[PDB]
Amino acid sequence: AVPFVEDWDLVQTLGEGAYGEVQLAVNRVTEEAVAVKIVDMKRAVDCPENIKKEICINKMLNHENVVKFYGHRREGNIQYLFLEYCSGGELFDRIEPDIGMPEPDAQRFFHQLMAGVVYLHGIGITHRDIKPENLLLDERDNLKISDFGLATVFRYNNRERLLNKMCGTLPYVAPELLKRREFHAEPVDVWSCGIVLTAMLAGELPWDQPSDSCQEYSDWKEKKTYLNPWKKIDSAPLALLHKILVENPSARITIPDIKKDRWYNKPL
Numbered sequence: 001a002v003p004f005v006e007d008w009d010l011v012q013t014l015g016e017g018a019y020g021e022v023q024l025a026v027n028r029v030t031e032e033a034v035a036v037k038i039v040d041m042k043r044a045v046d047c048p049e050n051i052k053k054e055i056c057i058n059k060m061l062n063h064e065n066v067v068k069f070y071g072h073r074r075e076g077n078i079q080y081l082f083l084e085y086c087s088g089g090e091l092f093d094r095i096e097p098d099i100g101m102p103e104p105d106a107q108r109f110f111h112q113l114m115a116g117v118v119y120l121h122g123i124g125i126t127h128r129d130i131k132p133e134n135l136l137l138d139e140r141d142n143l144k145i146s147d148f149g150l151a152t153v154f155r156y157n158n159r160e161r162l163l164n165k166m167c168g169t170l171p172y173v174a175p176e177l178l179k180r181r182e183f184h185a186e187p188v189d190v191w192s193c194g195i196v197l198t199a200m201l202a203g204e205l206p207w208d209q210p211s212d213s214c215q216e217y218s219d220w221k222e223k224k225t226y227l228n229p230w231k232k233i234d235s236a237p238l239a240l241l242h243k244i245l246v247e248n249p250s251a252r253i254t255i256p257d258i259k260k261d262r263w264y265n266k267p268l
């Protein structure tokens with residue numbers, strides 16, 4: 001018998017798209033603040049097995065570089081996923097178009113990203129859509145991974161399953177998802193962390209998509225690093241990007257090896 005907090009007022013929009021939106025919410029009492037993803041389960045096909053799968057995965061999660069799940073309310077047919085509020089905003093907005101950000105800052109964000117991904121992969125979960133818009137800064141300006149709407153489980157019982165499904169955001173997607181039927185999930189997330197890195201350091205994405213029909217991508221395979229955005233990236237992290245942006249997912253650097261990378265371990 002103690003009523004007053006858990007009734008949230010939708011204070012303002014944060015980022016709306018085609019599924020509802022996200023609202024900063026404040027408890028009418030505790031004054032607690034949270035992010036609320038609004039989503040109407042309209043019909044039954046692109047939801048009954050979409051938003052539900054997202055809640056399922058959010059419950060498994062618990063790491064400091066992963067946005068927190070505080071429950072959900074499915075009263076009628078509208079879904080409210082109470083999620084951790086990160087007043088720092090999206091990593092996207094700290095990237096100065098065509099400039100990026102101070103290398104030290106990028107290195108710190110990359111470490112937190114790697115810690116988050118290391119965490120996820122360890123519990124057999126793959127995000128499948130890592131990008132600056134999905135990476136948020138909390139009140140301390142520390143990076144946390146969010147939106148697991150496209151995420152899934154690939155390992156468990158100590159057994160790894162292979163993927164084949166083609167999802168994600170083009171510019172940030174790995175080539176195997178465009179030329180292979182099946183593929184390991186971990187290598188894809190790493191590839192995407194590599195694109196985020198490029199963006200933080202260069203303030204621009206390398207290509208529109210990873211295909212030989214894309215010049216920018218072809219130039220990369222040909223080592224034309226005198227071309228943007230590479231020319232804007234110091235040789236140390238560029239050397240790491242060379243290890244991450246490898247077409248053959250079997251020859252791609254693993255996370256345990258990125259942590260052994262010089263630039264990665266460099267005191268900046």
Ligand SMILES: N#Cc1ncc2nc1OCCCCCOc1cc(NCc3ccncc3)c(Cl)cc1NC(=O)N2
Pocket residue numbers: 013014015016022035037067083084085086087088089090133134136146147148
């Ligand atoms: N799935 C999922 C998910 N879980 C937790 C959160 N967002 C999610 O959604 C991620 C895509 C959301 C778009 C980014 O949202 C946001 C946008 C802005 N800036 C808005 C702003 C404030 C002041 N001036 C300019 C812009 C802020 Cl300050 C926070 C969030 N997001 C959150 O606090 N939490």
